[PDB]
Design a protein around this ligand. Structure first.
Ligand SMILES: Nc1ncnc2c1ncn2[C@@H]1O[C@H](COP(=O)(O)OP(=O)(O)O)[C@@H](O)[C@H]1O
Ligand SMILES: Nc1ncnc2c1ncn2[C@@H]1O[C@H](COP(=O)(O)OP(=O)(O)O)[C@@H](O)[C@H]1O
Lengths: 430, 430
């Protein structure tokens, strides 16, 4: 089975993966750039290998260096985390071709869902509901493109298969032509949707389960800020419908490992936009409400084992929230690298802290600005929110700026308190 | 209802109580000694009052100063935490007589269960199983005392109603006489029992529930070191039997609030030794396996509300462990006050940290040596243990000594791994 795993990532998710490995008795190899020698998980790892200089291009995106690390350590598998190479099919392909297990789906499936048009085709075949659209690429025969847009209904949106709006017909031709500058398709533009996403696991034993959903509508510049689970307004009946369509889609496409079907959710209907073929940042809210350890399931599935429970075993209990704590100015969102002189992290009942940051740690400039994920749980959404407010008020990060004040403004917002705000709400508020 | 609570305690439990209050929207008054100005919960409290100098006698045990604090702030209630005045019936009596709600049972009931002989009588009446004993005080008519010991069966143990062994008859008279030097009783001496204790809540609406049990057998000098829940070997049938006898005992005696029935557990049988009429240090392991917030229930019950669930609503899930992290030498157990230069606390899935300690905090000499409670949860006892081992390995407390190495030796012990070690096991190992 799996005895040694290369953690092909950094920061909090690398620590998250190390903790799972260690619980399973799996040896760890931390590959790291020169700037990340002092990462917590590196310092805890059984073996360490420096795979390149600070810039991502020359380290965490360095495919031959990472594979070479697995080779020299005699590792069995490589966990890509999220970001970086986790949805890079060329990397997955090279990892498997080199004799190692990729902790993720097969390369073919990454490619399939990595292309918007082919992704949508597969979902459509599987019976997962999709945004009404061209169902395939557009030409630039304009008469035909105008017919289709008319069918779909304005406003429509032109989109790269690998993003421009049209609110009227006279704008369509040039709207399309210029968007190409690579293939393009068009679909309905949904103006006030929420972001609701279903977590799944599928194994090599023909099993696939769904683990409720998360609402990730609080976003800025298409970057998630606060996530929660379950999604408000969603009943168990709706959950079982959309959920079950997602699990069967996993089977049809031969999915393997953890993944997420992301939807735009509007007036009661789900509309597919993306499958993330990897673990996601916000996975912990789902863990809190289901009792599943998603990274541990990733490792088991990669080793050949079955998912460790059945669909009927999972029952949503309570509610959970996650605030992404970033080292950035809370107003300008300019990054704020530098030394954390003191960290005081919060705790108590229903509080979870996922972070690689520690007193004396220096947040570098080279990567993203995430320093911690603060996650709370309660019997009710209301309790999870109050618990989050209190945990944030206790949290002290000294020496750099953080977006904690932004989280505090979100949590006390009367519309957020009610729940169900849409994906444009945060940008408007600001 | 309750709008303002005086937290008549310090350290971690004072922080625990503040967090519950704040979740409920209840205003807080932190009473503190001169040495505790810099306690985390003091720094978070809505109001602060210095009730005296460093020594316990002149601060946290100062009844008129604490009551005076409730008076000047117009507080509604006083939460005694554990230790200090929490089982002092004169304090409870004075608090109620002064117009404030005591968050705890009535004074009469504290007195009842504060005396070993009357406690045992009440349990016996309620049908809670007790150690075979004299059922009342001994005289020093020696012929009669010898008859009773013979009935009970040696070895027996002579005990103060407010502790000497006898293994044979010829030692009994002088064993008794000298133990008085205050009333005395005698009961069976159990040589290899475990410490297993049942958590209850009882409200002012005639309800009483049991929340499974905890095993606290890992002890040194009668001080608990590691606690877990549920207790290994205990089936749901046994749990419901002993549990239900405990809840009905609450009703018979008119119990109010949180409490614990402690038993010595041997060859399948429970034997009552003490009711703690207060919240206990180790309450969080029960929270992790039941989903109940015990301090929040204490506050609700004190305000007049019903317990917020029914017995049929509680179902034990998973397993939880707690290590009491103390500032002391791990070998000599000599206290280790002084400045914590850096704290790095652990986290991730299934890890809970209850501590008032922070980087730059100075642990004082005047009180106990507890600085944190590290609590883990898992689907199985095995997962909880491994999670605890990993969390301890991540924990860094710099500038003072701690008993973390003791916890690490306990957790890796093959007998502990199996489970069910008795109350003498740790002292022997050392
Ligand atoms: N049909 C649609 N209606 C409205 N907005 C859309 C639609 N399709 C995509 N979008 C916008 O584009 C975003 C996706 O952009 P993209 O860069 O592909 O991110 P991701 O990789 O998360 O899909 C969505 O969050 C949404 O705001
Ligand atoms: N019948 C008994 N057999 C063996 N040990 C006993 C018995 N009764 C009491 N003890 C010992 O005395 C301890 C209780 O001492 P005490 O100072 O009263 O602490 P507590 O307040 O927790 O009861 C028990 O943990 C146990 O070790």
């Amino acid at each position: 089975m799996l005895e040694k795993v290369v953690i092909a990532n950094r920061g909090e998710i690398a620590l998250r993966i190390l903790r799972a490995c260690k619980e399973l008795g799996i040896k760890t190899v931390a590959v790291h750039s020169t700037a990340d020698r002092d990462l917590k998980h590196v310092l805890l790892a059984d073996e360490t290998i420096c795979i390149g200089p600070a810039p991502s291009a020359k380290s965490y995106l360095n495919i031959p260096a990472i594979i070479a690390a697995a080779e020299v350590t005699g590792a069995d598998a490589i966990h890509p985390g999220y970001g970086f190479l986790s949805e890079n099919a060329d990397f997955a392909e090279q990892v498997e071709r080199s004799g190692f297990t990729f902790i993720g789906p097969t390369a073919d499936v990454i490619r399939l869902m990595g292309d918007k048009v082919s992704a949508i085709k597969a979902m459509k075949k599987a019976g997962v509901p999709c945004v009404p659209g061209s169902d395939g690429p557009v030409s630039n025969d304009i008469a035909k493109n105008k017919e289709i847009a008319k069918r779909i209904g304005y406003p429509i949106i032109i989109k790269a298969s690998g993003m421009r709006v049209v609110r009227s017909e006279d704008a369509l031709e040039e709207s399309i032509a210029m968007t190409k500058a690579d293939m393009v398709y068009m679909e309905k533009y949904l103006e006030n949707p929420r972001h609701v996403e279903i977590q799944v696991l599928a194994d090599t034993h023909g099993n696939a389960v769904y683990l409720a959903e998360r609402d990730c509508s609080m976003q800025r510049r298409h970057q998630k800020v606060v996530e929660e689970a379950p999604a408000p307004g969603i009943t168990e009946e709706v959950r079982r419908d959309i959920g079950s369509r997602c699990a069967n889609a996993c089977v049809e496409i031969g999915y393997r490992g953890a993944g997420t079907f992301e939807f735009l959710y509007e007036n009661g209907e789900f509309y597919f936009i993306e499958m993330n073929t990897r673990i996601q940042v916000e996975h912990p809210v789902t863990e809190m409400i289901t009792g599943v350890d998603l990274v541990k399931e990733q490792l088991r599935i990669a080793a050949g084992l079955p998912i460790s429970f059945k669909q009927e075993d999972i029952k949503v209990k309570g509610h959970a929230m996650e605030c992404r704590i970033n080292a950035e100015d809370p107003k300008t969102f300019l990054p704020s690298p530098g030394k954390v002189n003191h960290l005081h992290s919060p705790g108590g009942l229903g509080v979870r802290w996922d972070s690689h940051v520690y007193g004396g740690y220096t947040v570098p400039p080279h990567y993203d600005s995430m320093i911690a994920k603060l996650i709370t749980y309660g019997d009710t959404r209301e309790v999870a929110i109050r618990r989050m407010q209190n945990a944030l008020s206790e949290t002290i990060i000294d020496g750099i700026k953080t977006n904690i004040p932004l989280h505090e403004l979100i949590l006390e917002d009367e519309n957020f308190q009610k729940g169900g705000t849409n994906i444009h709400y945060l940008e408007k508020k600001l």
